[PDB]
Design a protein around this ligand. Structure first.
Ligand SMILES: Nc1ncnc2c1ncn2[C@@H]1O[C@H](COP(=O)(O)OP(=O)(O)OP(O)(O)=S)[C@@H](O)[C@H]1O
Ligand SMILES: Nc1ncnc2c1ncn2[C@@H]1O[C@H](COP(=O)(O)OP(=O)(O)OP(O)(O)=S)[C@@H](O)[C@H]1O
Ligand SMILES: *[C@@H]1O[C@H](CO)[C@@H](O[C@@H]2O[C@H](CO)[C@@H](O)[C@H](O)[C@H]2NC(C)=O)[C@H](O)[C@H]1NC(C)=O
Ligand SMILES: *[C@@H]1O[C@H](CO)[C@@H](O[C@@H]2O[C@H](CO)[C@@H](O)[C@H](O)[C@H]2NC(C)=O)[C@H](O)[C@H]1NC(C)=O
Ligand SMILES: *[C@@H]1O[C@H](CO)[C@@H](O)[C@H](O)[C@H]1NC(C)=O
Ligand SMILES: *[C@@H]1O[C@H](CO)[C@@H](O)[C@H](O)[C@H]1NC(C)=O
Ligand SMILES: *[C@@H]1O[C@H](CO)[C@@H](O)[C@H](O)[C@H]1NC(C)=O
Ligand SMILES: *[C@@H]1O[C@H](CO)[C@@H](O)[C@H](O)[C@H]1NC(C)=O
Length: 1804
């Protein structure tokens, strides 16, 4: 059991070692992919980012100075690691060291002090002020700045406008700020409705800009107070310079920047016009509830007024996209980038929403609410950003499968190859169980897999791809994967019966099972938990599911290790060990599947007796052996009771189908006997089992050798397997090697270098165990007769002792070697015995014939006198045949009769006698039928016409296939167009209702500071009851404690620490220690320790958090909220989006009443102006001082990952304020405000880019058209490939056909066939009303493009007919290649077009400039280009043409240029090719006979590497009036000479001339008069035979009116009347041969060539061929016939030439040969002594001529000079003594037998 496994493993290792280039490629292919992966890793290392905090943004409602301060200082949005002062519940401002704030505080305190006082005291107070000094220093600055923006930033933290432009264009930061401010400074507010209510709303919009325009009055009062004081009496210059600077800034002010529009269409037109001038900024639409014109939204929520809907339309390049709520790829980032994401800050959307909402509340409420709104960004933890790990999670299975596709292909190829040559059956014959075979396969294939896995593990660990992990677990994963994939490859090898088919399908079967993993990862959340395990039954799917868990565990900073093998890293991911368990279960299931499937198709591979020897020792005793198959009710083998005997070489006789090899397999260990017994050596076959193998040898009818192992390893392997010991193999090896004469070959150790002799070696293998019984099976099945002598010598060498049982098809072989013969025919035995006994039992006797150049009764009386027995069988004139009695036949009587007849020859006028001994052939036949009975220019026009007709009939023969290949794609396209009538989603921007409720269930805040006020209490009530909470606040007091219970294990930790809310209460948080990377921060159990009070309303949770830290709580709690949905990381639903803090502390000085009183007192005094301008200024100042209190504020925290959170929460705040200031009652339900977002249409320049991303249905239609359009050329080319496989094409070429004209005819017919599908597609497009195609300016372009693409595509794959030789696979491969090329081109172009965000891809347009050289992509590009150009034209002017040579003209021109070059290439590819014997050779050399039709001279062929000429130095001459014949054994070179003379092949040396026209010098006239007939059937099965006949008739040039009549003649000479109507496909075996003969004969060629015209068909067919050839030979025409059957050559031909080894031998007429050497007699002696000298000596002494023939041990034949003067009897009497003189049992004489010419044919 172990020795067989060792031998199998050694053999497999030897196969692998003898291929020293496949191992290297298998090792170095998977390393390339992983080196690419390592390079990719080196390209993108992970990025690290620490914690950072964000400042606050003040809305204009809070103030104007802080507003500009924010717009000028917080533009960069830089992170700050330290906590910002704004976040703390106390402060509400960030800038405390700013000059503006200090100046305002100093002014306030000085004014308060002055008011309290009411000069020296005031001067002293103002002297100690650094802010005034800083302001004076800033005023006294000699430029030093790029522009006023820099000075404004330093202070805070028209031709004049042209000068400002010139100054500000220099500084890049000033450029950025100026770009941000340009839309808004020069803005043009527009509104559609002009009703008075809207007028009041825009009056509320006015009042802000009116407050803005107040510096003019203060300025003018300054210059009207200036000169007065100056006349009454550095500071004066500084104020004037400052005032003039202020005036210059206000010079480039829009002032009246508000405008109006009459209607929505006019609104859009005016907006686009202003965009053309770069002046448009925003537009507002006050849609009314009663209008009911709501696109994709409800008309009105409640009847009547009270609800205001407001739409803001701005430029798309400014307002963010408004289609999807969230990003599709979650990123570990704060999502705070001013340039890209923070668009609402420099876009002004929030500003205008605030302004409009405040106007609406001030109008509807009827009060003047004051509440400053601020915006804050929640802070974000420290993080590591690394996209690569998700890429591994999604990519690693792909690279692993691509690395292991190669070894799987090799494994399946090897398994199928070894199971193809039936070697497995031979191994099972010797006794090896299938289990050992499969175990050898397992352990031999599984080595390289694990070596590759180990190398991959080392690469992964060392290459930093999977660090922080222990390689042991990774290896235990890859090993399970390798086991599963090897088992599944063995399963894949169990469905195929061909080598290359299995090799090319196994890789595809392995790769096609990785797609479901992608399908599952796309809809990751869709699939439940139940279907996960069911889908993970595939091996690659399970590997992917395990790889995702491995990557997920890698993200958490601790890789795969022994600690966490059985731990699930997330609630819905497999543990790493469970995946391996499933992998092993899958491998076991695949193994069981292979085991069961191997048994699905079992079995099928895909009374005369002479028993009396001197020693009766029945070594093999088979009795009544029977077997039956279910294929036929009659048994495969019937009763066979024959008994064999040791020492005799029994043999089997029968024609193929006699069930001999079946029985020989029964006796071996391959098949089971159904009945009877098969006792070998005494013990039954099954009982012996393994007790019989050393004493039983088998050799099968197929050669059994390994193409890589040498001879010595071969004998070693086949000896050690039988039971031989390793010590005694040397002598046995040497014995067999010396016996077979391979002692030289074992020196070079080759197996595939030597051929033909290999069968000999196989025979020797049957004699390696010295087994007593040996069963051979046709040891000379196919070996050349020239080498059967060695096999005969070896088999006779081992003829003693061993029982040998063989079987041969022949009849001569069964008597040379065999000591006995039994005849089996029709699966049954008929007779048995020995050749002597078989020849001694006949109805007839021993024949004697006499010819005439006297009297029958006289000769009969003479014969009866000389011998009593005599039978008269034949009595016709000119030959008298009598039967001499075999019963009691004696030599003396025959000798006396012959001696008497010798003298009386002249008188009797006989002049010749012929004796005859019955032979084995006729007795074999007679017993076979006895057993059978007992069982029961105009010519070119006609040529093209005929070719087109034959193509049309060829198409009409196969109509269903062409119909399904042509019409079906059109119906497919039509159905695709029908089903594509749904609304196309392309990315339009609908109307979106911007409210917080769109996000869904969430958690929100209501933090409050300084709650000591009733108005703030009302505002808080509005905020809470706005979200759906219960109306009475006291109910919350009824709920009392509404918080989750604190964790018990955390209470002790809290008691350990201070736990004050102001101090950091939570414990610290883990982060990146440098040696380890964590994606989130791992949260402890104490983050924001006390669970804050939460109340749930209607799908929403509100939390208190009053008085806590807030920032710390959010930073600590965020990852806990996120992690619930990081398993898939596709659409992450953050739960906390925003919240409110009711801050109340006033950063400014609240004491503004005193300042107002002081201003009023100053207004009363100082001579107020009668006009009141100063009075109005002072009133405005008093109002500003009164409003300076800022009684209540509000801050909104928002999360930026939700795109539309800022606007939703600002809307909520405004609505809450409105509901707060409205008096209580049911009227609260009547009032509401709504805000929408709707970007405007694209401008023309914007359209020129935006039209690109509106093509999905177009892409689908183009893909469908390309897929359905690339089928026809393959259908065209399959027919040509099929006609190339058969040599019928060349048969056409000997007609009038030329290859160029054949190509032209095929091209024209395929054009005519192709013109229909294009018309069908065109009519489908026209009938289905596609505006994209039914336009009159688009139809001609589409038609021309389709027709010219079909023009160009066809000659692409015509040159491919030479490469392939089978129709179906050629069609499949060509279709797949074309579809792959088209789809890849289209996808690459569309991907580069959509993803062309960066500029270095637009130059990739040159790539398409190359694709015009590819003809398949021209149509796909042209359709898309035409569609986009025409759609742009439709959308351009309504709200240049396809025929122009700018969109499709260039592509069409390039493709029509490409058209003819492929036809030229295939036309050039077609024409790529550019003693009697001595006396007749001498007469040919000296001169040429003019009458001879064919003349040859030194005809020679030298193949490549054969080292010997197949046909060498061949000469001949054929007179026209005689039929020729060529003879030779297989391998002589007759077919090579036939091909060379016909012209299908070239000649290495020498040329043959036919009727004075050499083949090379001008082939056309040569082929005009040659009738080609090969052994193969060169016909088209689709057509009919008669149709072939008229096709050849029309090609030749027969007039049409007689062509049909010719058909009758074309059958009248060869019958064919019953088979005329039937198609050529459904005929008989000989019908094809006779049809080929008729096609050769039709047309009346001068000479007719036939290669093996008849090979064992019905006698009627050969009689008809005989008649046809006789006709053509006595009508004065010549035939060159090649055959084997000698009687046909005798009957038909008049000259015979015999050739062996490529050279003539006799070259004479049949009668000349018969008289030259086939006369006399030959003697055969049966000597058992096997001694040459005793038999040779006396024969040479008495007879001068004793030439040897087949000198073997059993028999020897004698050649002697003919024409003995004495009688023939002169030998017989001598033999009558010679039996005593020398050992001779019996004898035979062949004296002018019917087999003399046969004997010479077999002689040489
Ligand atoms: N797959 C099969 N293989 C062999 N024999 C079959 C098969 N199917 C049916 N038979 C039976 O085989 C008989 C016909 O002779 P075969 O057994 O095929 O001859 P054979 O053994 O191939 O002949 P030789 O002369 O020994 S090569 C009929 O009884 C068939 O029904
Ligand atoms: N691929 C090949 N095709 C044809 N002949 C070949 C090929 N390879 C070698 N030969 C030579 O063909 C010769 C043996 O076949 P031939 O005598 O030419 O014809 P044939 O086998 O008698 O023809 P049939 O009767 O039509 S199968 C030897 O010279 C071979 O070396
Ligand atoms: C949020 O927390 C505060 C505590 O700061 C709760 O205020 C209490 O409310 C009840 C009911 O109105 C009063 O009787 C208590 O006197 C309040 N306590 C203090 C110390 O303020 C408040 O109820 C909680 N939620 C709400 C409804 O705002
Ligand atoms: C701006 O876009 C709107 C669509 O949002 C266009 O209005 C539609 O125009 C089509 C004609 O092309 C009509 O069939 C629709 O009924 C219109 N819908 C609406 C809502 O009116 C509008 O024509 C575009 N204007 C410009 C100048 O591009
Ligand atoms: C923002 O800060 C970065 C810090 O490097 C600086 O390089 C950049 O110029 C700043 N940009 C603006 C707009 O201030
Ligand atoms: C602002 O600065 C002043 C003067 O240094 C200081 O008294 C005051 O406490 C500061 N206030 C804040 C908000 O830090
Ligand atoms: C105020 O807005 C109104 C629209 O109601 C507009 O007519 C007017 O010009 C604006 N005021 C000024 C002077 O800009
Ligand atoms: C909040 O927590 C932070 C954590 O650094 C701490 O520095 C800060 O003092 C705390 N502030 C309050 C008022 O809770």
């Amino acid at each position: 059991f172990w020795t067989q496994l060792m031998l199998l493993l050694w053999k497999n290792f030897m196969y692998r070692r003898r291929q020293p280039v496949q191992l290297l490629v298998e090792l170095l292919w998977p390393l390339f992919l992983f080196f690419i992966l390592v390079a990719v890793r080196h390209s993108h290392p992970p990025l690290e980012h620490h914690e950072c905090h964000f400042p606050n943004k003040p809305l204009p409602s809070a103030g104007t100075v802080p507003w500009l301060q924010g717009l000028i200082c917080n533009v960069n949005n830089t992170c700050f690691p330290q906590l910002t002062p704004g976040e703390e519940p106390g402060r509400l401002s960030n800038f405390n060291d700013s000059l503006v704030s200090r100046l305002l505080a100093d002014a306030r305190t000085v004014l308060g002090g002055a008011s309290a006082h009411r000069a020296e005291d005031l001067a002293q107070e103002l002297l100690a002020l650094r802010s005034l000094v800083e302001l004076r220093a800033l005023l006294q600055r000699p430029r030093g700045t790029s522009g006023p923006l820099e000075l404004l930033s330093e202070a805070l933290c028209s031709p004049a406008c042209s000068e400002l432009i010139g100054a500000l264009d220099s500084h890049p930061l000033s450029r950025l700020l100026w770009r941000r401010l340009k839309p808004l400074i020069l803005g043009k507010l527009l509104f559609a409705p002009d009703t008075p209510f809207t007028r009041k709303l825009m009056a509320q919009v006015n009042r802000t800009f009116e407050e803005l325009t107040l510096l003019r009055d203060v300025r003018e009062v300054w210059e009207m107070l200036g000169p007065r004081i100056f006349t009454f009496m550095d500071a004066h210059a500084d104020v004037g310079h400052l005032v003039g600077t202020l005036g210059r800034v206000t010079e480039c002010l829009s002032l009246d920047k508000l405008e109006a529009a009459p209607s929505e269409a006019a609104l859009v037109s005016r907006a686009l016009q202003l965009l053309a001038e770069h002046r448009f900024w925003a537009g507002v639409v006050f849609l009314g509830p009663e209008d009911s014109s709501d696109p994709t939204e409800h008309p009105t929520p409640d009847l009547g007024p009270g609800h205001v809907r407001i739409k803001i339309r701005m430029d798309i390049d400014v307002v963010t996209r408004t289609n999807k709520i969230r990003d599709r790829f979650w990123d570990p980032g704060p999502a705070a980038d001013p340039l890209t994401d923070l668009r609402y800050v420099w876009g002004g959307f929030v500003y205008l929403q605030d302004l409009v909402e405040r106007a609406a509340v001030r109008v509807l409420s009827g009060a003047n609410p004051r509440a400053g709104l601020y915006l804050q960004q929640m802070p974000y933890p420290c993080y590591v950003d690394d996209v690569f790990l998700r890429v591994l999670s999604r990519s690693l299975p792909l690279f692993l499968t691509l690395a292991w596709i190669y070894s799987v292909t090799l494994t399946v190829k090897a398994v199928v190859r070894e199971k193809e040559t039936r070697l497995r059956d031979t191994m099972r014959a010797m006794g090896l169980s299938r289990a050992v075979l499969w175990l050898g396969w397992f352990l031999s294939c599984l080595g390289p897999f694990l070596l590759s896995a180990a190398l991959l593990v080392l690469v992964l660990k060392l290459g930093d791809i999977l660090p922080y992990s222990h390689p042991g677990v990774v290896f235990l994963f890859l090993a399970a994967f390798a086991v599963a994939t090897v088992t599944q490859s063995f399963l894949l090898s169990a469905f195929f019966s061909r080598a290359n088919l299995a090799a090319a399908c196994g890789g595809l079967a392995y790769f096609s099972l990785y797609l479901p993993y992608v399908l599952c990862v796309a809809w990751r959340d869709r699939l439940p938990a139940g279907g996960r395990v069911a889908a993970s039954l595939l091996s690659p799917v399970a590997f992917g599911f395990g790889c995702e868990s491995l990557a997920l565990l890698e993200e958490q900073g601790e890789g795969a290790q022994w600690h966490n093998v059985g731990t699930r890293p997330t609630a819905d991911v497999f543990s790493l060990a469970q995946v391996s368990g499933l992998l092993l279960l899958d491998a076991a299931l695949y193994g069981l599947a292979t085991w069961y499937l191997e048994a699905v198709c079992p079995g099928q591979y895909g009374v005369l007796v002479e028993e009396a020897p001197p020693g009766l020792s029945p070594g093999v005793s088979v009795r009544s052996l029977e077997k039956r198959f279910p294929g036929s009710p009659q048994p495969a083998l019937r009763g066979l009771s024959l008994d064999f005997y040791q020492g005799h070489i029994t043999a089997f006789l029968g024609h193929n189908g006699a069930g001999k090899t079946t029985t020989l397999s029964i006796l071996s260990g391959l098949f089971p006997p159904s009945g009877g017994s098969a006792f070998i050596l005494g013990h039954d076959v099954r009982s012996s089992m393994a007790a019989i193998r050393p004493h039983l040898g088998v050799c099968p009818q197929y050669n059994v050798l390994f193409d890589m192992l040498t001879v010595d390893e071969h004998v070693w392997f086949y000896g050690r397997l039988k039971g031989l010991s390793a010590a005694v193999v040397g002598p046995e090896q040497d014995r067999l090697l010396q016996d077979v004469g391979l002692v030289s070959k074992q020196s070079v150790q080759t197996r595939h270098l030597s051929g033909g002799m290999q069968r000999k070696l196989s025979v020797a293998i049957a004699f390696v165990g010295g087994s007593q019984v040996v069963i051979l099976d046709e040891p000379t099945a196919g070996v050349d007769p020239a080498s059967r002598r060695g096999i005969w010598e070896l088999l006779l060498k081992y003829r003693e002792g061993r029982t040998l049982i063989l079987s041969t098809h022949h009849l001569d072989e069964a008597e040379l070697l065999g000591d006995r013969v039994a005849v089996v025919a029709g699966g049954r035995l008929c007779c048995c015995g020995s050749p002597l006994f078989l020849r001694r039992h006949l109805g007839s006797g021993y024949y004697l014939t006499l010819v005439k150049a006297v009297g029958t009764p006289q000769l009969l009386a003479l014969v009866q006198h000389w011998v009593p027995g005599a039978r008269l069988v034949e009595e016709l004139p000119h030959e008298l045949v009598l039967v001499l009695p075999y019963t009691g036949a004696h030599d003396g009587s025959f000798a006396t009769l012959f001696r008497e007849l010798d003298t009386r020859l002249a008188e009797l006028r006989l002049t010749g006698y012929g004796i005859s001994d019955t032979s084995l052939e006729e007795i074999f036949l007679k017993v076979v039928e006895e057993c059978a009975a007992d069982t029961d220019w105009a010519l070119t026009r006609q040529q093209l016409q005929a070719l087109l007709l034959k193509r049309f009939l060829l198409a009409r023969r196969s109509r269903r296939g062409l119909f399904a290949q042509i019409v079906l794609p059109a119906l497919f396209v039509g159905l695709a167009l029908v089903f594509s009538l749904i609304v196309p989603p392309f990315g339009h921007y609908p109307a979106l209702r911007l409210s917080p409720t769109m996000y869904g269930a969430q958690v929100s805040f209501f933090s409050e500071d300084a709650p000591g006020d009733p108005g703030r209490a009302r505002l808080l009530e509005a905020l809470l009851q706005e979200a759906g909470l219960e109306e009475p606040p006291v109910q919350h007091s009824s709920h009392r404690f509404s918080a989750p219970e604190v964790p018990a294990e955390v209470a002790k930790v809290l008691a350990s620490g201070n736990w004050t809310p102001e101090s950091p209460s939570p414990a610290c948080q883990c982060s990146r220690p440098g040696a380890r990377r964590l994606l989130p921060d791992c949260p402890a159990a104490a983050g924001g320790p006390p669970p804050p009070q939460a109340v749930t309303g209607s799908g929403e949770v509100v939390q208190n958090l009053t008085g806590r830290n807030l920032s710390d709580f959010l930073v600590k709690t965020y990852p806990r909220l996120v992690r619930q949905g990081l398993k898939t990381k596709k659409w992450v639903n953050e739960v906390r989006y925003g919240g409110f803090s009711l801050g109340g502390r006033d950063p400014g000085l609240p004491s503004g009443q005193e300042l107002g009183r002081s201003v009023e007192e100053l207004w009363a005094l100082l001579s107020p102006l009668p006009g009141g301008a100063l009075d109005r200024v002072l009133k405005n100042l008093t109002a500003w001082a009164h409003s300076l209190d800022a009684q209540d504020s509000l801050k909104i925290w928002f999360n930026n990952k939700g795109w539309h959170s800022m606007v939703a929460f600002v809307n909520r705040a405004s609505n809450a304020i409105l509901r707060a200031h409205l008096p209580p009652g049911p009227a609260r339900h009547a009032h509401s405000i709504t805000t929408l977002n709707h970007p405007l249409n694209l401008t023309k320049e914007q359209l020129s880019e935006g039209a690109l991303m509106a093509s999905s249905v177009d892409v689908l239609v183009s893909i469908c058209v390309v897929f359905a359009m690339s089928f026809v050329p393959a259908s065209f080319t399959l027919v040509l490939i099929e006609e190339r496989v058969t040599r019928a094409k060349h048969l056409q070429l000997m007609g009038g056909l030329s290859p160029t004209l054949y190509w032209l005819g095929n091209f024209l017919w395929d054009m005519c066939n192709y013109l229909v599908p294009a018309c069908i597609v065109v009519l489908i497009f026209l009938a289905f009303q596609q505006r994209a195609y039914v336009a009159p300016a688009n139809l001609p372009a589409l038609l021309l493009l389709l027709l010219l693409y079909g023009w160009s595509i066809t000659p692409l794959m015509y040159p491919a007919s030479f490469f392939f030789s089978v129709p179906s696979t050629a069609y499949v491969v060509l279709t797949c290649i074309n579809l792959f090329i088209g789809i890849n081109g289209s996808m690459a172009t569309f991907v580069l077009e959509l993803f062309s965000d960066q500029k270095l891809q637009e130059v990739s347009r040159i790539l398409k400039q190359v694709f015009l050289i590819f003809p398949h992509f021209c149509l796909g590009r042209g359709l898309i280009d035409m569609v986009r150009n025409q759609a742009m034209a439709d959308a351009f002017e309504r709200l240049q043409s396809p025929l122009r040579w700018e969109v499709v003209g260039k592509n069409l021109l390039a493709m029509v240029i490409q058209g003819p070059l492929f036809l030229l290439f295939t036309l050039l590819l077609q024409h790529r090719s550019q003693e009697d014997v001595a006396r007749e050779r001498e007469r040919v050399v000296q001169g040429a006979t003019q009458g001879d039709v064919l003349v040859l001279r030194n005809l020679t062929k030298v193949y490549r590497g054969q080292r010997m000429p197949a046909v060498d130095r061949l000469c001949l001459g054929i007179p026209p009036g005689e039929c020729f014949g060529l003879l030779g054994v297989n391998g002589a070179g007759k077919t090579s000479t036939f091909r060379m003379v016909t012209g299908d092949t070239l000649a290495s040396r020498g040329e043959a001339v036919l009727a004075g026209h050499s083949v090379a010098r001008e082939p056309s006239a040569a082929h005009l008069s040659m009738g080609y007939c090969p052994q193969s059937d060169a016909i088209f099965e689709l057509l009919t035979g008669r149709e072939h006949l008229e096709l050849l008739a029309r090609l030749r040039g027969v007039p049409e009116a007689q062509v049909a009549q010719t058909a009758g003649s074309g059958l009248a000479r060869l019958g064919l009347s019953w088979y005329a109507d039937r198609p050529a496909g459904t005929y008989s075996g000989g019908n094809k041969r006779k049809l080929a003969t008729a096609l050769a004969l039709v047309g009346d060629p001068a000479v007719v060539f036939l290669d093996e015209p008849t090979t064992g068909m019905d006698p009627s067919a050969r009689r008809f061929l005989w008649n046809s050839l006789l006709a053509v030979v006595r009508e004065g025409r010549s035939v060159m016939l090649t055959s084997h059957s000698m009687e046909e050559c005798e009957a038909l031909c008049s000259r015979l030439a015999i050739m062996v080894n490529g050279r003539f031998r006799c070259l004479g007429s049949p009668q000349h040969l018969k008289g030259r050497f086939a006369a006399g007699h030959t003697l055969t002696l049966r000597v058992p002594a096997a001694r040459s000298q005793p038999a040779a000596a006396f024969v040479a002494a008495e007879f001068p001529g004793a030439e040897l023939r087949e000198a073997h041990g059993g028999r020897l034949r004698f050649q002697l000079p003919p024409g003995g003067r004495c009688a023939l009897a002169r030998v017989f009497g001598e033999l009558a003594v010679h039996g005593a003189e020398h050992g001779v049992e019996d004898f035979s004489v062949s004296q002018t037998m019917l087999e003399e010419v046969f004997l010479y044919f077999s002689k040489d």
